[PDB]
Design a protein around this ligand. Structure first.
Ligand code: U
Ligand code: U
Ligand code: U
Lengths: 131, 132, 131
């Protein structure tokens, strides 16, 4: 576990349908993630700079290019996925290989229904990536 | 207060549920405890040899017997408790009077959110128990 | 894979229609699951303490509160679903975020006709949840 991470600039890209994963689900998930990440000493600080819905792997690269060009110092994009989807492989291709932007994927189900254990799982994955 | 302590073999036993004291809490607490104990000349070294959840006073003795048999040279078990619990008296009965195993209890609120002052409080207790 | 799990108190809630997933299908599935779980060293011990049909997402919260209020030490509710259904999200809403009750869902088609591979699939998922 890496100490000293501070996530100041971060975004949400929700590829799950808004009807399943609504804005108030995203906001409640955000506040719970902020609380546990701060308590664990890897604070995800502030609201996300960007939080939008998209659909389809074909929307990943245009969205991620916009994010990279628009938010200097963006440190992480949290990517919400509707279960098993080609969006995952495209997010990793665009983020890790095309553009060089850290992404952390999370299942829609764990945003719809947050629990401490799944938030913890997510923080540990983010810690590996950013530490 | 004793200088020159080195805690090389140590375990974590968490008797609060994972939903209350999650894996990221345990790992962050471990790393913060390693850092301050090293700076204060009583380093708790490395990763714990064992870090598991259990529930209820009845689980204490089998777990501690397992620990004593499995990890030779075990110097300390850090025991995470939710607060007041019968598990505390049983930890001390088994560790202090049955198996001769050092234990240090800590409340989950100070694992969920560490601070320098509460980690210092805990290191002072550990130093009393193990110094010398 | 976790060793040392023993499932002593568990329930079945069947949201699939009885005319598709009958009592003999449920008993067969139960007994086959018990045998393979023992093979694998995660014995599901005893018959379920409760095995009933349920109709609709509206039945989830009343039934799960009834289970919590009636069976001390309940470890798992195995939930049989008729394919894709809103019942799934409600089961997880109640179990994971209201009452703190472990649930394992299974598709009705794999209760109507079990195979060792689908029983194994289910055992692995239970093992992760309870481990
Ligand atoms: O199709 C997929 C593939 C992975 N995932 C999730 O992505 C997560 C891994 O994301 P990561 O590689 O950014 O760490 C993991 O929790 C998977 O469950 C999906 O939701 N859908
Ligand atoms: O039932 C109890 C008793 C003590 N404790 C805590 O145990 C700590 C002392 O542990 P110790 O005896 O191992 O030094 C102290 O911080 C108490 O707050 C509990 O959490 N529960
Ligand atoms: O609407 C749904 C959603 C999931 N399921 C099944 O639920 C299972 C997942 O259950 P779990 O989340 O309890 O592990 C998986 O086998 C899915 O196919 C349904 O049968 N219907």
């Amino acid at each position: 576990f890496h100490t000293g991470i501070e996530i100041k600039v971060w975004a949400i890209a929700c590829f799950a349908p808004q009807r399943q994963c609504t804005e108030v689900h995203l906001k409640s998930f955000t506040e719970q993630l902020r609380k546990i990440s701060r308590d664990a000493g890897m604070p995800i600080q502030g609201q996300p700079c960007f939080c939008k819905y998209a659909q389809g792997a074909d929307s990943v690269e245009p969205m991620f290019r916009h994010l990279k060009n628009t938010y200097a110092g963006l440190q992480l994009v949290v990517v919400i996925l509707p279960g098993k989807t080609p969006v995952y492989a495209e997010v990793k291709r665009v983020g890790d290989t095309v553009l060089g932007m850290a992404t952390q994927c999370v299942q829609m189900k764990n945003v719809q229904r947050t629990t401490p254990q799944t938030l913890s799982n997510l923080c540990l994955k983010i810690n590996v990536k950013l530490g």
